[PDB]
Design a protein around this ligand. Structure first.
Ligand SMILES: O=C(NCCOP(=O)(O)O)c1ccc(OC(F)(F)F)cc1
Ligand SMILES: O=C(NCCOP(=O)(O)O)c1ccc(OC(F)(F)F)cc1
Ligand SMILES: *Cc1c(COP(=O)(O)O)cnc(C)c1O
Ligand SMILES: *Cc1c(COP(=O)(O)O)cnc(C)c1O
Ligand code: NA
Ligand code: NA
Lengths: 251, 394, 394, 251
């Protein structure tokens, strides 16, 4: 719902969406909440938030470090959900998407997980290690709780995969860093957001020109956090400047 | 879709990022093809026979069972080239890599045995092997690390995270996701995403097939039970496979009990864990109440895997196979007993299987039973571990 | 008198104190008896097959010979239980001890491999094993010492003299002279007083017999030459024996050249020693100008024997077998080459044999030749030795 | 020759012979020469002298230590022969027997060894590791140079061995510590000297009563040397008292 409204609004303004990613609780619950409010105040159109997991076979160094920092702060999934509730209470319209690993969703029951997402105000969930082939239980539970199931569309995706992603996904299609963008639109897929490697303003403008509805940036954001660990204030200052620059490129 | 069933009941699957599905699908197709290719089977059989030393002996241990009605045989995988059963399947997987036109092998290891096995197979078949290993492990397994480098493998220390194998398990997968066109990921046990549990079982199946032929020749009948230790599940499923349809044959898997199940310091996820989704599969695993993957423990580094192959979870669920646990102390006693009574130094991993057989015998000495223990490996590598513990106890 | 010829030409004999002659005569008679006893042969064959793992593979090494006209096969004694060929004959001798109604075994060791082999055989066959070992050796071979004790053998440290093996070789004989009625002295190589050189050869003969059958099956003809390292001479005579009458088959024995023959620091008595009388036999040996037994040297402790089996000296004298030497550096290069190109870690002892085969190939790359190297053992035990040397050289 | 004269003389006096054994050069050339003169002055009827060898598979600890001490003094076979020449020049009638290991006799030629023995005045040679079965070359070379080849007669020796020892030996038969003594006389064997374990006067008298012509004592002698290493004078004093006591028991 929030995604539909956002993209409709962005379209009327002929601009793309800029979506930063950060790990909840990195480097601490307090600082993480401040980081997120700064990202939003700086121009973030939506958020992708990760929940610290012990065995994440999909994240790179920058993000791996984020989880370590969060765990060093004693961050747990329960605390992450408490943070999410607070974030939603402060920002009623911004779409909030979670980046999860299957075990944390399956742990206490798939249905229960999505029900918790719905109660705190989460809009979408991308389960990193659940390919479309194993997605049935996840996307069904997601839809039952008005949560958009997000799917990754690789650049080499064949026709069958494009059709599956277009049919199963909601909110937005996570396009890994064109004609696929055209094919996805042909199959009425959710608006595409390009992710992976987006760290400069020109990449955001390029994504929008290619036909994508926006771009996602994570490592670039998290790197700013880890380089200003000893200076919380400078960390927020740097994040504000980066996000504002990236968002400007989408207009 | 897939060519073969990725599940064993509710267990298994292919829980990997979308980007890795093409690699798994390619591998499954290549495997199915290889399995029906007489030429592939012949090449594999040739390497197993003339390079690895198959068939391995089936040794009757008369001294150990004296005074009881138990007849005990040991399937001698400790005599296989490399000193452990791992060699069987790495040779098969290396051949699959070549069938797919690949010249590179990616692997990761903890105890170092799989790294060594991967390295020897790669050296023999002209494959460029790179092995990811946790910095902490590279420190505790200096001997195995040198063996890997001696055999031309590139050992890559990964410091990320608690530099345990899980950091290299992922490091390997990240690499594979962007190099699978020219590199094959040589998974080390009968676990992980389909088709690995199936491939590893089929490439270890000769253990059970030989055991059946050998026991029929020597005793004129099948065993009352075959017993094997379970870390990831490859040597056990290799022994179990050909006997699954022989309903009279018991299948007993032995997980490490560590300091005791009640201490929480063990490696028995199948019977004391909780089903979860990790390492590309749905299977029982060591995990916290909120879903974080717990750490396993065992005196034997080789059984220190936090989860277990899906086919074992399935066989347990339907009651075809039974799983038990053996503590560090029980494994140590079995290790010392085999050394003194049969002149065979067993791997501490295998010692867990032997320990349970000894329990079956000792608890009911007048019970007539024909047992086969899969001696998955030799224990020359465990001499220092056993020594230190003994001395520490005066 | 004796039942069999104690000499090989001028070499051999029974140069022991009179008190020990009854023991040697008893042993010879028991051996001759055993050799004609179908039951003894069957029991020995059963242990070799079902306990030790025979037959061992004959591995074709294609990577190593690429670009040349040499075809190289490795007789895989490294796959035998224990990791070395020594196991074959200790099992045979243990059976002979039992045939003579003895329940005790006396042995001595330097590198520790023979001690370990003696211990495992004794444990399997219910024999009380006591092993004399020099204090200095017991210090440099802690791993092997623990293996011996793990298998129930009593390891007796002897401090007398330069506590080298010669002090325990004697300590063992002194014991045997007064306990031979109930204890058998398990000599470790094809040397010493008759009947040992003969017994050890016959109990190692299967190496050559299998090699012949295997090479005929695989190549349809005999080898142009079989190559084996020579410390005391057991693995080499074991490989040579069945080929002695096949005049077209070259027999090449490789003695350790150490730091180089010209340095005097080597272990090549057959070609660079002087005939003398010691250890109960007349044979070439490392000795001073006035007759004191010199010290041998080799990077490989296993080839550090100061003399050589009499049958080798004889075969050399008549020109049937040719003997050469290989230096520490040549052995080390062969060790590293086999690891990287075939995925097999060879014993440094065996590496001397491989090194000469590599020389035969490299020196005349266009010479068509079919060679078999006796891979007498695996080299996991030599990993630290090779490591230290490599590091010391940056 | 010297043995025949000695035994003839001892018989006329109805007494047995006492023969001490020591290692030439132990603990030094000088002290060894003094030790030997003391043994003779104390009553030794004959001497058995060892030549230090590196690999002697027949001697016990006490004697093994003697060789080590001699080698530590740099004693060589050549120096041993120089000592023997001197000993003979000082004592013209005492029988001198050597205890050798085969390699030192075979080294530069068996014939040459016995020729050297004859030139320095040695009377007999016992090669420890040469059983009667391998003795041909040794006893033949010995006889060619007027050297008596000595053979050990074990206590369990069967009839054939007794006959061989009786036929091949000269000087004296080395009897390892009775009816054998009677059988040896029956086969006209050289006079028997009992050796091994003889360390007390009563053992000497017992040997003579059993019918033996005398007794040999080594370890007991050498032990006195190693216990008085720091006191050369006391060493000779102790040796004199021991030898005199043992010799007295033979009268
Ligand atoms: O959304 C996340 N990345 C955001 C930005 O990527 P980057 O800017 O390169 O960190 C993101 C999404 C999925 C993911 O798992 C897998 F790789 F398997 F698909 C890992 C990271
Ligand atoms: O004559 C020597 N011993 C003299 C005294 O013996 P003991 O008094 O016990 O040292 C003596 C003679 C032979 C010998 O070799 C072997 F044992 F093989 F026969 C060792 C020592
Ligand atoms: C690797 C290993 C094991 C554990 O692995 P599985 O896959 O459970 O068989 C057991 N025994 C030995 C000797 C091993 O090397
Ligand atoms: C003992 C050993 C040798 C040396 O002994 P030989 O009697 O000369 O064979 C050679 N290779 C290995 C592996 C050994 O263990
Ligand atoms: Na496990
Ligand atoms: Na030698």
């Amino acid at each position: 719902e929030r995604y539909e409204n956002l993209f409709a609004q962005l379209n009327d303004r002929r601009e793309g969406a800029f979506v930063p990613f950060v790990t909840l609780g990195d480097p601490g619950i307090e600082q993480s909440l401040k980081i997120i409010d700064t990202l939003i105040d700086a121009g973030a159109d939506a958020l992708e938030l990760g929940v610290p997991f012990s065995d994440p076979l999909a994240d790179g160094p920058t993000i791996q470090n984020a989880n370590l920092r969060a765990f060093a702060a004693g961050v747990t999934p329960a605390q992450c959900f408490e943070m999410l509730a607070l974030i939603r209470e402060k920002h009623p319209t911004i779409p909030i998407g979670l980046l999860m690993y299957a075990n944390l969703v399956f742990n206490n029951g798939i249905d229960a997980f999505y029900a918790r997402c719905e109660q705190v105000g989460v809009d979408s969930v991308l389960v990193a290690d659940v390919p479309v082939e194993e997605s049935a239980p996840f996307r069904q539970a997601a839809l039952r709780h008005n949560i958009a199931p997000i799917f990754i569309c690789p650049p080499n995706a064949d026709d069958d995969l494009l059709r599956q992603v277009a049919s199963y996904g909601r909110g937005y299609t996570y396009l890994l860093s064109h004609h696929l963008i055209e094919k996805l639109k042909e199959y009425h897929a959710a608006p595409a957001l390009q992710g992976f490697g987006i760290s400069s303003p020109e990449q955001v403008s390029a994504a929008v020109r290619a036909g994508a509805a926006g771009a996602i940036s994570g490592s670039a954001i998290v790197k700013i956090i880890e380089k200003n660990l000893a200076s919380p204030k400078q960390m927020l200052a740097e994040l504000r400047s980066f996000v504002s620059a990236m968002k400007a490129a989408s207009r | 879709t897939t060519l073969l069933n990725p599940y064993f009941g509710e267990f298994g699957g292919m829980y990997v990022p979308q980007i890795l599905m093409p690699a798994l699908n390619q591998l499954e197709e290549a495997f199915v093809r290889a399995q029906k290719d007489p030429e592939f089977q012949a090449q594999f059989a040739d390497l197993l026979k003339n390079y690895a030393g198959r068939p391995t002996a089936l040794t009757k241990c008369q001294n150990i069972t004296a005074g009881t009605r138990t007849t005990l045989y040991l399937k001698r995988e400790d005599l296989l080239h490399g000193g452990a059963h791992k060699t069987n399947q790495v040779l098969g997987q290396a051949l699959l890599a070549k069938r797919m036109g690949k010249s590179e092998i990616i692997a990761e290891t903890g105890a170092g045995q799989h790294g060594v096995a991967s390295a020897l197979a790669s050296a023999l078949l002209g494959l460029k092997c790179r092995i990811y290993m946790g910095a902490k492990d590279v420190e505790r397994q200096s001997p195995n690390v040198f063996r890997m480098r001696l055999m031309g493998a590139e050992v890559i220390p990964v410091h990320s995270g608690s530099a345990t194998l899980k950091d290299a398990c992922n490091e390997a997968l990240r690499d594979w996701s962007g190099s699978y066109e020219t590199a094959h990921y040589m998974l080390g046990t009968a676990a992980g995403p389909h088709p690995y549990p199936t491939i590893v079982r089929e490439f270890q199946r000769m253990i059970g097939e030989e055991t059946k032929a050998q026991i029929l020749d020597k005793e004129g009948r099948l065993p009352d039970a075959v017993i094997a230790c379970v870390g990831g599940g490859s040597n056990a499923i290799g022994m179990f496979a050909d006997f699954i349809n022989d309903t009279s044959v018991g299948l007993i898997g032995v997980e490490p009990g560590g300091h005791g199940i009640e201490t929480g310091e063990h490696g028995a996820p199948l019977k004391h864990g909780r089903v979860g989704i990790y390492f590309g599969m749905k299977a029982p695993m060591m995990q916290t109440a909120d879903g974080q993957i717990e750490e396993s423990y065992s005196i034997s580094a080789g059984l220190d895997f936090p989860s277990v192959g899906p086919q074992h979870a399935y066989l347990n669920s339907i009651g075809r196979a039974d799983y038990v646990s053996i503590t560090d102390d029980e494994a140590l006693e079995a290790f010392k007993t085999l050394c003194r009574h049969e002149g065979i130094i067993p791997a501490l991993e295998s010692s867990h299987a032997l320990a349970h057989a000894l329990k079956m015998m000792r608890e009911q000495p007048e019970k007539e039973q024909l047992l086969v223990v899969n001696l998955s490996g030799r224990g020359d590598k465990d001499i220092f571990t056993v020594h230190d513990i003994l001395k520490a106890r005066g």
